[model samples]
Target: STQDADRTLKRLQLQMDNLESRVALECKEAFAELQTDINELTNHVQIPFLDYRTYAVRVLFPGIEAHPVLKELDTPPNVEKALRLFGQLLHSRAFLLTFIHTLEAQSSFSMRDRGTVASLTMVALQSRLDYATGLLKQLLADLIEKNLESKNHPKLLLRRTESVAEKMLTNWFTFLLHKFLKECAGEPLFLLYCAIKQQMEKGPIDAITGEARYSLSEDKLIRQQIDYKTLTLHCVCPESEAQVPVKVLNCDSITQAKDKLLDTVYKGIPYSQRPKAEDMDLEWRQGRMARIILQDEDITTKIECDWKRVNSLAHYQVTDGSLVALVPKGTKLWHLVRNHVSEIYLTRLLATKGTLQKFVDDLFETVFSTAHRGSALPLAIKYMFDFLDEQADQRQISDPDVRHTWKSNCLPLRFWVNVIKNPQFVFDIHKNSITDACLSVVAQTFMDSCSTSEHRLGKDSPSNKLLYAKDIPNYKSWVERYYRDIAKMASISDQDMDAYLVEQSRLHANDFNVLSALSELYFYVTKYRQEILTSLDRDASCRKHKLRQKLEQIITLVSSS
Candidate 1:
C-alpha cells in the first residue's frame, strides 16, 4: 500500500511540473505577440514615409514662380508668395512632416532665412494657431524622444544625433518662433506664443544638462505690452517726507517702477548715498493705518489691496492718484515702523464695540480673507500672539482664572485649531524673517498656554470644547521628535547639517507636513542657544552664519517676551 501511494504522488508531481512549464511558455508567447503589436502601432504612428524633396517640390513649390530654396523666399515679395503656398499646404500632414525633415536636413539656409521661413509658415497658418503650436510641440517632442533613445546608443553616435536634433529644435523655438512673435505676428499668435512660453517655463529643467529646455529671448518688445498708457504715479519717500511724481508705464512691474523711482529720486544724489533698488520695498498706502507692501514681482497694472476691492488700473480708469511708499527694507527702521503699525492696528481692533467672541472672529476673518499676497496678515497675526504674550508677562495678573479668561477671550480653542490647520496663517513669501520669528512665538506660546488646566475648561463652555485637541499633542510630539532626532545626530558634520536644514526648510515651505516643524526646530534651537551655537562655531567657513542670524532673530523675539 505504501509503495503504491509513493508512485501515485510522484505521478501527480510530474503532472504539475508539466502544467507549470506549459503556462510559462504560453505567457512568454503572449507577451511576444503584445510586444509586436505595440512595435507595429508605434512605427505606424511615429514613422514618416513622405519623401521630403518630392513633397516640397510638388506641394510647397508647385509653380515655376515658387522657389524650393528657403533662402530665396527671404525677400518681402517672395515671402508673401511663400506664405500663400504654405497656407495652402498647411492642412497636409505629409507636407508638415516633409517640411520639418527638409529643415532638419538642409544646412544651406542662414539663421535669418530660417527665421523668415518659420515666420512665413506661422503667418500662413495664422487662423489655425492650434496647428502651428502643434507643429512646434511635435518638433520639440521629436527632439526629446531622440535624446532619450540616444542613451542606449554608442557615446559618439549619441553626441552626433542628439546635438544636431537639439540645435535644430532650439533654433526653431529661440530664433524662429521668437522672430515671428517679436517682429511679424499679430495679437492672437503672440498671445498663443506667450501662453506656450509660460507653460514651458514651469516645466522641469533638464536634469542631465542642468539647464532650461526652453530658453527664449528676453526681447522687451516680445515680453512687455508696448501700447500700455503712460501714467504719472506718486511714490512717497518716508525718509524725505515728500511725494515724488514718477511717470511709469502702466504694464511695467513694480521692480520697473522702482527703477524709474530710483532714477528720479537719486538723480543728483552722490552714488555712494543712493540706496540700491533691492534695499527698498514699494508699499501701497491704502489709508492712515492700512498699507500693503507690493512685492517686486507684482505688476503695476493693478492693486489688489486686502481692505479694498480690486482696482484695475490697466484700462486707465483711475490715473496718477494711487499713492505708493518707498520704505527701506531689512533695516532697524523697517522693523520699528512695522511694529508700530501692528500696535496701532491691534489697538484699533481691540477698541471695537463688539463682544470678545465677535472681536476674535473678526480678527480671524480679517487675517484669512485678505486677497493681498503679502506680509500684512502674517504681521497682524504675530501681533495678536504678541498681545497674549504681553498678558502672560504681566506680573500682577497671576490668577489662573483671570489669565484663562483673557486668553480664551483673545484666542479661543477653535481659533487656535484653525491657525494650526492653516500653516499659511503666519507664513508669507516676502517676509521670511517675520515668518520664522512669528512661527517660533506661536509654537512656544501654544505649548505653554495649551497645557494649562484653565485651558482644559471644555466642560462648562460649548465654544471651548477641546475641538481638534489632538492637534496640540500632535504638535508637541512633532516638536519633541524633531529635537530628539537632531540631538541624536550631534556628531553630524557642519556641511551635512547645513544641507539637512536647507532641504528640511524647503520641504516645510512646500507643505511636506501639516505642522510647522521648522518653527518648532527653531524654538528648540533658541531654547538651547549656547549649546547650539557652540556646535555651529566649530565650522570656520561661516556657512552657518546665516543659520546663526536666523536663530538669533528668534532668540531676540523669544527673550523679549
Candidate 2:
C-alpha cells in the first residue's frame, strides 16, 4: 500500500496533474470572458420612470410617484419652492409625532402579547417593566432629528414648519420605544439604549457630507440585497465534542432534483439591492427570510436539529470510528446533498448571514458545508443505542477548542448563572416554569457546535465529510453516539456541569429509544431555555429547531424546477 513504484497510484497522479493543468487554463479564459462582459455593459444607458428611481434604484413600482420628467419644478401658477419645502417640513413634524404615539401605544400591549400573556411569571415581570421604561426614554431621543425632516417624514404634505428642537425630536423618541420594547433586545432596556442612543450619537460627526453625512443612501438605509460573492470568511468558535443543535429555516422547494431545480435561490436577481428589514414586509417576508436564514424546514413552525453519528466519511482524513453525533440518543437526521450549500448559490448564502456585512456571510456558508451546526438530541438517541465508547476517543484529540465548550457556547447556561449569582436571588427571584426553562439550559450538558473551519493560528484544511454524498443521514446510529460522546465532551466551569450531570445521566440512561424520530424532530423546535430574555423574548413555541413543511412548499413554489 505504501509502495513508491505502484503503477495504479502513479497513473492516478498523472491523471490528476493533467486535469489540474486543464482547469487552470480554463480559469484564465473565464476571467478574460468576465472582463469582456464588463467592458460591454459600460456603454448602455437606461431611462427610468422616476428621476430618483432611475438614478437610484433603477427599478419602478408603478403608481408610486408620478411627477415631471424634468429637474426644474417652476410653473407660473404654482406656489414658491421655499413654501413647498416649508409645508413638507410641517407635515413631517406631524407625521413624526403620530409615528411616535403609535409606537408608544404599541409597547403597552407588548407585555400582553400572546406569548408573554401565556408565560410571564412574577419574577420576570419587574425586569420586563424596567426594560420597557429605559427603552421608552431611548426611543424618545432617537426620533428627534430623524422625524422633523420634511422629506423623510411620515406626513409629506404640510402648510407650516416649526424650528423648535423639542418639536423636531418629538415623535422620533416614541417610535424608538416601540421597536425597542419588541424586536431589539436581550433585556428590553439593552435594546432600547443601543437602538435609540446609538442613533442620537451618530450625528455631529466629522464629514464634508454635512447634513447628508447622517443621512445614508436609501439602499443601505432601506434594504440592500447582499453582494454575496464578495463575502470574506471568518470562523468564530472551534469544533465541538458534544454536538450543538442546528436548525435550518428554508423554503421547501430545495427538494427538487438538480436538473429540474434552479441551482440557487438568488439566481438571476440583481445583487445591488440587498434585502433589509425595511424592504421586508415583515409578516409575509419574515416567513421567507427566516426560513432561508435559519435553515428550518419548509414549515413556518418546524425546525430540524442534526442528531447523527457516523464514523465513516468518504475521503475524510481521520479515523473510521471518530463520528460526530447529536445529544439525546437516536434522533439522527442529516441534510440532503442537494439541499446543502454550494458555490453557485451566492445570493441565498449571502442572505443566510442575517446581516449585510460580507465576512459574516462567508462564515455561515463555510460552516454549513463544513462541520455544520451540531445537535444534542441525536447524541441522546445514540447514547440510548450505545454506539460509541467514550473512553477510547478522549485520548485521541483533547485540544481545548475541539473539546466541548460546555456552558460557554450555550446561551441557556449564561441565563441561569446570572440570576443565581444575583445577591437578590433569595428575596426577589422566584422560580417557576420560566425558572425551569432557565435551569434546563444552564444545567444541560451543552454539546459544542463550533466549526473546524478556522480557530487555530495556522494554514488549515477542510474538516467535512460529504462533499459529494447527497442523501438523508443515518438515523438510529446517529442517536447512539450522541448519547455516548456527549458526556465525555466537556465539563463547564465552577458554575457547575456537575449539577446537570444527573439530568444528563438520566438522558444517557434512557435504555429504550423513548422518542420517535418525528417526536425528536418536533423537540428540536420545542426546547426553550428560560434564563435571561431571548432575542425574540418569546418561549420556544415561537422558534423551531427544525424545518417545517408549509415553508418548504413556499420555497419550492418560488424555486425554479
Candidate 3:
C-alpha cells in the first residue's frame, strides 16, 4: 500500500518537475480536484459563506452609505485596482493555505489547540479576504471620487512599517479571540483540572512523521488559541504508571509540569509508587538508551545535555513518539536551547582552555556590558566576586586570579578595556567580599574616569544630603563592621582605607550624624602603630588632617556620614 502510494505520488511529482507552466497546470488540476472532492465529501452542501450574501455584506453595512462612490465604484481604473487587489488576495491566501497546511501536517500545536488552530486557519484566510475586499472597495471609491491614489492609501502608506502584518491580520484575529473565549467561558477550572489528566492519553499522530502528538478530547478542548502548543504524557514512572492520559502545556516548565503531575498523580498511585519529587522525570528517547537530562539525580541537567532533546524536530532526530508528548516550556526550553545554542553562539569566545576562557570571557563581557556608572559597578563587581565565591564554594578553582582577583591583581589592558567597556550582569557578590578600601577605590576610579558625571550638589542645608548621597547604598552598620573587619584584620592598605573613608564622607556631604556615627570606627583606626599606619599612609593628603579634625568635632555637630 505504501509503495504504490509513494510511486503514484512520485509519478505525479515528475509531471511538474521544475517547469513553471507545468506546475501551474498541476495546481489548476489539483484545485479542481479539491473542489470536486470537497463537494463529494460534503454532499454538495454549500461552504458557509462562499456565496453572494457574504460578499455583499460589506457593501450592505450601514456605514457604506456614507462612502457610496468608493463602495459602489465600477469605473475601469477602480475596477482594475480592485481586481488586482482581489488577485493579490487570492495569491496571498494560497501561500497562506500552503503554509498553514504545512504546519498542520506537523501537528505541532497541542491537542486542545488543534481545533483552535484549524478554526484559526479557516478564520484567517476568510477574514483576510474579508478585510482586503472591504479595504479595496474603500480604496477604489477614494481613488475615483475622493481623489485618492493607491500609493497614498492609508494602509499602503504604513505597509512598509513594522507591525503592518499585525495590522493586516487584526481583522480576523479578533474572531479567533472571540472563538477561544466563547469556547472557554462555559468551562470552569474544569479546563485546569483536566489538563494533567488529558496529558496521559495517547496523542494524535503526525501523518507525515508518524509520531504521536498530544491532543485534547472533545469536551476537554475548552479554548482554541495559539499561545502555547499542547501534548499528552504517559507516566513512565513504574510505580505511578498512568493507565490514562495526562495533558500538559509547554507554558509550564518541565519542572513545573512535574510538580503538577506529582500532585495530581499522588492520589492515584499505589502506596509504593507514590510520586516522590525525584520520581517525576521527563524522559525522551535519546540514542538507544532512554535519555534523562535532569533528575537523573533529580533536576534538569546542565548544558552538556543533548540539543536534540530540546530541538528534536531538527537536531536530535525523533523516530518515535517519546518526546512528542512533552510540552517543553519557553523559559526552561530557552535556557536549554541557550545552553545548547551557546555551545555554538559563544564557541569562538570559549575556544581552547575552554574552561578558564569561557568563565573569563563570559564574566568580563557580561560584566562590562552592564556597568555604566561607578555605582553601577557595585552590581557588576558584585557579580564578578560572586562567581569566584561560587567557585570557592564549589572548590572548583582557588588560584589568586579567582581568589584575590579584583583586590590584588593589576588590571589587564583588556580588563581595563572591559572596564572602559563597563557593563554589569547577574554576577553579584556580598559587599563583604572586598575590603571597604577596595570597594571605594573601584568606585572612585570609575567616577574619576568620568569626572564630568553629575554630582548635582544643591544649596547647603545642614540636614539635607546630596541626592546621590541618599541614592548611595547605605553601608551603615555593615559599613562599620566592614571597616573594623578590614582595619582589625589588616585586610586592606591603611592609606587607601583612609582615602576610601574620606571619599565616602565627601560623597555623602551634609548628612546628620553620619560622620559622628562613623567617628567611633574612624577613631578605632588610630590605635595602629605609627610606623604601621604611616607605612600605609600617602604623602600630603590634606583632607586626612582637616576633614577628620573638623568632622570628629573636635565632633563636627554639623557632621555628615
Best by lDDT: 1
In candidate 1, which residue ranges exceed 4 Å CA deviation? 1-82, 110-126, 137-561
TM-scores, one per candidate: 0.19, 0.17, 0.17
Residue by residue across 1-561, what tens digits does model 2's lDDT show? 347436654664454344434445444453344334323322232111122212211111112233222124343322233233222321232322222333233323332231221111111111222232233233333432244332342221111222111221222112111222122221322211112212211222111111111111211111222111111111111234222211111211111111011111212222232232223221111222231221122233223464431211111221222222211113543322111222222222122111112221222222122122342222221221121122113234334332222112221122222322221121111122222322222122111122212222111211111110111122212322333344555433322422333343343232212122112212112222111113222323223421123222322332333
Question: Which one is best on TM-score?
Answer: 1
User: Cα lDDT of all candidates, in order?
Assistant: 0.36, 0.23, 0.29
Off by over 4 Å in 3: 1-140, 143-561
Sorting all predicted structures by TM-score, with the top scorer first, yields 1, 2, 3
Measured by C-alpha RMSD in angstroms, how accurate is candidate 2? 30.8
Q: lDDT tens digits, residues 200-311, model 1?
A: 2222222112222112211111221124556777878645677877766554445545655775565444333467667888666766686776653334433233221111
Better of 2 and 3 by lDDT: 3
RMSD of each: 35.0, 30.8, 36.0
Error in Å for residue 558 of model 3: 47
**Regions more than 4 Å wrong, model 2:** 1-24, 41-50, 53-95, 107-140, 143-561
lDDT of 2 at 549: 30
